[PDB]
Amino acid sequence: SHMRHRTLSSSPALWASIPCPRSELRLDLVLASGQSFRWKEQSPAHWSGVLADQVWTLTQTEDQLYCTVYRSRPTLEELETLHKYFQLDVSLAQLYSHWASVDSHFQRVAQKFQGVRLLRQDPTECLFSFICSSNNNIARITGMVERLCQAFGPRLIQLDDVTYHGFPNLHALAGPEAETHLRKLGLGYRARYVRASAKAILEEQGGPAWLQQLRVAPYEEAHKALCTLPGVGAKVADCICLMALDKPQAVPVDVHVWQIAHRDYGWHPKTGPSPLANKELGNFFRNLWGPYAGWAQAVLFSADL
Ligand SMILES: CC1(C)C[C@]1(C)NC(=O)c1cc2cccn2cn1
Numbered sequence: 624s625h626m627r628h629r630t631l632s633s634s635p636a637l638w639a640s641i642p643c644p645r646s647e648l649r650l651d652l653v654l655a656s657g658q659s660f661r662w663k664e665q666s667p668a669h670w671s672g673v674l675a676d677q678v679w680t681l682t683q684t685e686d687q688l689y690c691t692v693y694r695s696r697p698t699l700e701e702l703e704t705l706h707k708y709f710q711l712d713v714s715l716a717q718l719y720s721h722w723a724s725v726d727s728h729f730q731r732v733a734q735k736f737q738g739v740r741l742l743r744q745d746p747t748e749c750l751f752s753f754i755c756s757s758n759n760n761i762a763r764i765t766g767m768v769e770r771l772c773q774a775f776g777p778r779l780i781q782l783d784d785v786t787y788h789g790f791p792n793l794h795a796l797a798g799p800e801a802e803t804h805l806r807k808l809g810l811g812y813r814a815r816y817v818r819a820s821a822k823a824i825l826e827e828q829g830g831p832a833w834l835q836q837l838r839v840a841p842y843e844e845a846h847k848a849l850c851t852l853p854g855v856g857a858k859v860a861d862c863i864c865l866m867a868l869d870k871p872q873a874v875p876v877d878v879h880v881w882q883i884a885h886r887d888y889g890w891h892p893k894t895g896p897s898p899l900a901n902k903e904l905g906n907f908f909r910n911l912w913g914p915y916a917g918w919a920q921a922v923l924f925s926a927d928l
């Protein structure tokens with residue numbers, strides 16, 4: 624049978640709920656704001672996307688987070704993965720209270736933009752997404768990741784006229800004629816860094832377990848470990864630390880963070896963008912906001928854009 628994208632009222636038996644306030648999580652500010660490039664609003668207030676070889680559709684009310692999975696309702700083990708994915712153990716109301724008390728700009732700006740939090744993405748999925756995010760906007764990166772999973776990744780399921788695929792493994796990305804195939808999709812110079820980084824993680828280090836070890840390791844050790852890989856610079860390493868390897872203190876610094884820091888906080892380097900000045904600006908926000916520095920940065924990004 625031809626399968627369709629599910630809404631809450633259409634097939635209500637297949638939906639399971641999680642008790643989650645709207646102030647703790649807003650899906651329309653988190654799922655397509657540069658963190659993850661896998662979610663699309665197919666029908667109004669209904670975001671569909673892949674999570675480790677399984678398609679989901681997500682929606683919410685003022686007090687509930689309704690979710691469904693495609694193959695019956697989601698299991699208690701599958702509801703545990705979404706609780707870890709959104710990181711609902713971390714209370715967002717305590718952080719917004721902490722940031723607002725120690726920052727006047729945040730107190731005014733973060734009124735309208737509640738429920739902005741960091742996702743807990745897969746390190747492999749997160750790493751190769753931001754390697755091909757070199758001077759490209761959200762629409763361009765979302766196209767690259769979709770075509771990347773279509774060609775290399777395994778086919779999962781079709782809903783309406785959209786074929787969903789899982790994310791490619793390290794073996795597929797580190798193939799024999801992979802660079803030629805990746806260049807055909809429209810990667811450019813980034814295609815070489817995907818093949819090189821895939822060979823480094825799989826062959827030399829071990830596999831996906833090496834990136835899982837960095838999640839347990841410290842922030843300085845994790846960031847330095849990512850920078851050794853080919854293609855991963857300083858800014859992309861901080862993105863992966865914040866979004867995958869459980870480093871809330873990590874602050875990705877680029878030209879847009881310079882604009883906010885300069886205009887809204889009056890910041891300057893003690894000496895334009897540079898390795899020393901960007902490192903200083905990351906520490907400035909860690910000193911202001913505290914251990915959840917990158918989470919506060921996500922709120923300003925949502926409010927600015
Ligand atoms: C999407 C895009 C063009 C690649 C850019 C420039 N976005 C980000 O790097 C970024 C960083 C970040 C830190 C906390 C939340 N964030 C959300 N998006």
Ligand code: NI
Pocket residue numbers: 885
């Ligand atoms: Ni100035």
